[PDB]
Amino acid sequence: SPPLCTLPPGPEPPRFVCYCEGEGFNLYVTDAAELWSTCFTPDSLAALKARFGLDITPRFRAACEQQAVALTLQEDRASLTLSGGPSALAFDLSKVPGPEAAPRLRALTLGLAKRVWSLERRLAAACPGESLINPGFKSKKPAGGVDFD
Template sequence: MEPPAGPFFPARHGSQRYVCYCGAEPGAAFNAYVTNASEVWSTDFNQEKLERHMAQSGISEDYSTKFREAFEHRTAALTVHNGRATLELKEDAWSLTFDLFKLPSSEARMRLQALMFGLMGCVSSLEKRLEAAEGAAAAAAAVCRSEKNQPRSQKLLMPDLSPRKNQGGGSAVLAKRRVPGESLINPGFKSKKAPTGVDYEDS
């Protein structure tokens, strides 16, 4: 027996808790189930019964889609009475009612085993997806931290080329101090003769 793929929905009736779910069976494309972890109720559809129910409901769309929509919107209602269960799905544009019948104990055990292994498969799949998502998030965070810290480190390593200002707010370029005897026209050339001044006697 193949584990049910779901969807799954937790429901209550009085003080009892139930799990509603659906799955495909040999000879039928769809069946709905309800269990309280000790007993199991089923729609017991074969292909003929399923087609008859779909014709009466006026809905030709896959019932699994309708169950998923109702379960996601939490518009499913369950009642259990006299060994039978009734599951109602209600949306704005449609409604469905399913009568479910209690399965014999031997078949109920098989269904519960299949349900347990199906839920284990769902949990394992979710854990793998969560682990992959956490790894991707950690890698993205590491890249963001690297990009955030990179300009700062480059700034610390680069020389400061910005112009410096003196205290008076003047030009940042400091004038080179002229050495006595150095030519004003040709900086760097130093006269070999000492300056003698102006001779006024010859004039």
């Protein structure tokens, strides 16, 4: 159950959708046309964890369920604020190239469709040739001699 959230989630149609995957895990936020990813790396991830004293996945899921995620966009930069723990955590993202992202949107759409189908289904129910005389010896055809073609 990969956590995800939408903004706005109220009666107004959502504009942006945020999620996480592959815990090179990077938070992906998309407007269905453009994307923003953290592009985390093991060294950068370790440095961030040390700075914040650190898994973020449980906190991210708790915020998404409680809709405690704050978005900000400015040109190609995006800022996320996550709340629910002792101290809110801030993350930055840059506009990932479109050519590299197109497979990402395709995979996200396919996974969303699969999840929709699965969750709807779940909610609905709620030795020829062996010689007979000598076993173990293959039967042998009688000698036909010379049969001209």
